[PDB]
Amino acid sequence: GKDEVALLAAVTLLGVLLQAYFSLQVISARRAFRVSPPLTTGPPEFERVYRAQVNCSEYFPLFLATLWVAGIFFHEGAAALCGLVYLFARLRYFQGYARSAQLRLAPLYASARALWLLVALAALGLLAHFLPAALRAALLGRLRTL
Amino acid sequence: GKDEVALLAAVTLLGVLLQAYFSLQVISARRAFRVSPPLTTGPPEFERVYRAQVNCSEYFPLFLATLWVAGIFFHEGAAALCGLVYLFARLRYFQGYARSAQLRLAPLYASARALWLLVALAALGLLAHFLPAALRAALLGRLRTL
Amino acid sequence: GKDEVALLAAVTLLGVLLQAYFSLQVISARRAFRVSPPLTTGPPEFERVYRAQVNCSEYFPLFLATLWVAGIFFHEGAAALCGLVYLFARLRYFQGYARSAQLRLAPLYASARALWLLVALAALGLLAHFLPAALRAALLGRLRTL
Ligand SMILES: CCCCCCCCCCCCO[C@@H]1O[C@H](CO)[C@@H](O[C@H]2O[C@H](CO)[C@@H](O)[C@H](O)[C@H]2O)[C@H](O)[C@H]1O
Ligand SMILES: CCCCCCCCCCCCO[C@@H]1O[C@H](CO)[C@@H](O[C@H]2O[C@H](CO)[C@@H](O)[C@H](O)[C@H]2O)[C@H](O)[C@H]1O
Ligand SMILES: CCCCCCCCCCCCO[C@@H]1O[C@H](CO)[C@@H](O[C@H]2O[C@H](CO)[C@@H](O)[C@H](O)[C@H]2O)[C@H](O)[C@H]1O
Ligand SMILES: O=C1CCCC2(CCN(c3cnc4ccccc4n3)CC2)N1Cc1ccccc1
Ligand SMILES: O=C1CCCC2(CCN(c3cnc4ccccc4n3)CC2)N1Cc1ccccc1
Ligand SMILES: O=C1CCCC2(CCN(c3cnc4ccccc4n3)CC2)N1Cc1ccccc1
Ligand SMILES: N[C@@H](CCC(=O)N[C@@H](CS)C(=O)NCC(=O)O)C(=O)O
Ligand SMILES: N[C@@H](CCC(=O)N[C@@H](CS)C(=O)NCC(=O)O)C(=O)O
Ligand SMILES: N[C@@H](CCC(=O)N[C@@H](CS)C(=O)NCC(=O)O)C(=O)O
Ligand SMILES: CCCCCC/C=C\CCCCCCCC(=O)O
Ligand SMILES: CCCCCC/C=C\CCCCCCCC(=O)O
Ligand SMILES: CCCCCC/C=C\CCCCCCCC(=O)O
């Protein structure tokens, strides 16, 4: 039973490791521009790397929630593949943003498409687990029991 | 077995969609006040919408964790209903905060009550799954085995 | 079956309560230095408590994801104990940071060690659930079927 969700757990763990990488880059930028904590404002190069990390952290629970709903209710393999596509787009988004605000846009749109696809698979999976039972009950004249 | 958690998954998915709506409002505010990334400070109207979104994102994993613990250990329906009450209070909090800092207070207190209730249901459910076994073992003189 | 994950759910709930405590300290600091919302910049004492809370929130979903992957795939007790060690190190990190930026360092390194250990247990558990099957299939000449 655990192996039915092992792929989702592996993709989740890869997402956690990618967040540690983003945190490591913010530590390297803090030394490079002497922006010591608790300071978050500084040169534009520091601000971009810092904002890229904040964006990736805020979206991490959204990726996690939809990966698990899609993987359990739609299909495990399809959701894990979309999750991988999302993580790789977020790595490119972070790398682009570090160079410039404009270069973050193409990988940001790619990550938005991957997250919207996970949302769509989760919705399709939830409908596949609810609509057939409702349809069966309506045809049998037992919808109120449901 | 999956349908025993389908309601929690649907409420989780609705929470993800509400976060996309909050992100869409911050994008609209960025254009309205020319506060281009990586900038997060700007006019007070921009700052309120931006802070409302940050608050909703930071609390999203807390809502998610308690919704799932309460839904699995207490009762699925009761937790999903509290989760819906929490999400609707957070939408009103965001809308109020966009108009003024004071107008965010009543829906913020409403969202705090809904989150505290989910916490209480999760605690009640965890106690319901641990205390009876401990009581049974104490009455049988087998508490050390437990 | 639920009681096989009840310890992880209890540790998760304790982490949620600790986040409410961190939020309560930021509210007390807002009154102490008249830094009214939506303002996040202010005196250094306010900024440290505020940054300590933001750091704890951003890392909360990372703690949650690894606690659950390690607890399900490695061993429940070992993961719940590491999770407790992580939460206690984060409380000390918050208390140290409130006094000074330097005093946050020792408990921050302690919390990083606890989180890296949860990551290692999750990886060990995922390998324990995948490598034996791959090894069995390679020895039987059926790896392609897998
Ligand atoms: C209350 C709501 C009312 C009911 C609303 C119903 C709306 C129905 C939406 C249209 C159906 C979607 O159409 C369906 O999409 C999925 C995913 O893209 C496809 O699925 C295929 O591609 C996806 C892409 O990732 C793979 O993960 C999946 O394993 C594969 O089988 C189906 O082959 C297609 O039939
Ligand atoms: C180590 C700890 C020591 C032991 C501590 C024990 C403390 C016990 C707390 C008091 C018991 C709570 O009392 C109990 O509350 C719940 C929820 O409000 C009620 O439950 C009712 O209302 C809730 C409200 O959402 C619904 O979700 C639920 O389906 C319904 O049955 C029970 O009808 C009531 O009996
Ligand atoms: C594709 C990857 C290729 C394969 C890579 C394989 C790498 C193997 C890593 C070395 C093995 C780790 O070694 C193993 O560590 C764990 C945890 O520290 C120990 O486990 C022990 O201590 C941990 C510490 O928390 C307890 O939670 C656990 O219950 C206890 O049994 C094992 O007694 C030890 O044998
Ligand atoms: O991943 C990203 C990153 C960039 C921002 C965003 C794309 C543009 N945004 C839009 C666009 N059209 C919308 C239509 C209806 C409702 C809201 C809408 N939001 C805001 C969210 N997403 C998609 C997303 C985010 C969170 C959860 C689910 C999906
Ligand atoms: O939802 C909200 C939004 C507004 C802030 C807050 C309400 C006031 N806060 C308080 C009040 N009394 C307390 C008593 C003991 C310990 C801490 C306390 N914290 C801080 C948390 N919550 C409740 C919450 C938050 C996170 C997890 C669980 C619940
Ligand atoms: O908990 C903390 C808090 C302090 C920052 C940090 C420790 C230093 N950081 C490092 C150090 N060496 C690295 C080697 C390879 C890849 C990245 C690396 N990151 C950045 C993450 N962690 C560990 C962590 C964070 C998120 C997920 C998992 C683990
Ligand atoms: N740099 C990473 C790692 C987090 C971290 O180690 N933060 C510590 C050390 S810089 C801290 O308390 N920082 C306070 C702050 O970020 O203001 C991140 O931003 O997520
Ligand atoms: N506006 C939403 C969506 C996130 C988003 O699209 N952010 C992009 C485009 S504005 C970004 O990298 N922003 C950098 C920043 O927020 O400083 C939010 O704040 O969560
Ligand atoms: N102080 C806690 C609790 C969150 C909270 O209650 N925030 C409200 C009341 S101060 C809010 O909308 N704040 C806006 C802001 O933080 O700028 C935290 O920072 O997480
Ligand atoms: C191909 C999709 C068509 C769905 C067919 C549904 C059939 C009848 C809908 C009537 C609902 C009102 C009857 C209520 C009585 C009851 O079902 O308990
Ligand atoms: C109605 C609640 C009352 C609970 C009754 C508990 C009974 C006895 C508690 C004594 C505990 C010490 C005995 C240890 C020996 C053992 O149980 O293994
Ligand atoms: C102790 C670890 C040693 C592992 C032994 C693995 C044995 C043989 C590896 C050869 C793989 C190529 C054969 C492909 C044919 C097939 O398995 O379907």
Describe this structure in words.
With 146 residues, chain A is mainly α. Chain A has a single domain (2-140), classed as Membrane associated eicosanoid/glutathione metabolism-like domain (Four Helix Bundle (Hemerythrin (Met), subunit A), Up-down Bundle), CATH 1.20.120.550. Helix content of chain A is 79%, strand content 0%. Chain A is built from 5 helices and no strands. At the B-C interface, helix 2 and helix 4 of B face helix 1 and helix 2 of C. Bound molecules: dodecyl-beta-D-maltoside (3 copies), the ligand O=C1CCCC2(CCN(c3cnc4ccccc4n3)CC2)N1Cc1ccccc1 (3 copies), glutathione (3 copies) and palmitoleic acid (3 copies). The PDB classes it as lyase. The entry lists the keywords LTC4S, inhibitor, lyase. It forms a trimeric assembly. The entry is titled "Human LTC4 synthase in complex with compound 2". Chains A, B, C are Leukotriene C4 synthase.
**Residues in helices of chain A, as a percent range:** over 70%
Q: What is the succession of H and E elements of chain A?
A: HHHHH
The main β sheet of chain A shows up as: none
CATH class membership of chain A = Mainly Alpha
Helix vs. strand class of chain A: mainly alpha
The largest chain-to-chain contact, stated as pair and per-chain residue counts, equals: A-B, 22 and 23 residues
CATH topology of chain A: Four Helix Bundle (Hemerythrin (Met), subunit A)
% residues in beta strands of chain A: under 5%
Taking Cα atoms only, what radius of gyration of chain A do you get, to the nearest Å?
20 Å
The total beta strand count of chain A reads: 0
In the residues of chain A, how many domains can be counted?
1
End-to-end gap of chain A: 28 Å
- Quickly count the helices of chain A: 5
**Oligomeric state of the chains in view:** homotrimer
Q: Estimate the global geometry of chain A from the Cα principal axes.
A: elongated
Bound molecules: dodecyl-beta-D-maltoside, the ligand O=C1CCCC2(CCN(c3cnc4ccccc4n3)CC2)N1Cc1ccccc1, glutathione, palmitoleic acid
CATH architecture of chain A: Up-down Bundle
PDB class: lyase
Keywords: LTC4S, inhibitor, lyase
Assembly: trimeric
Entry title: Human LTC4 synthase in complex with compound 2
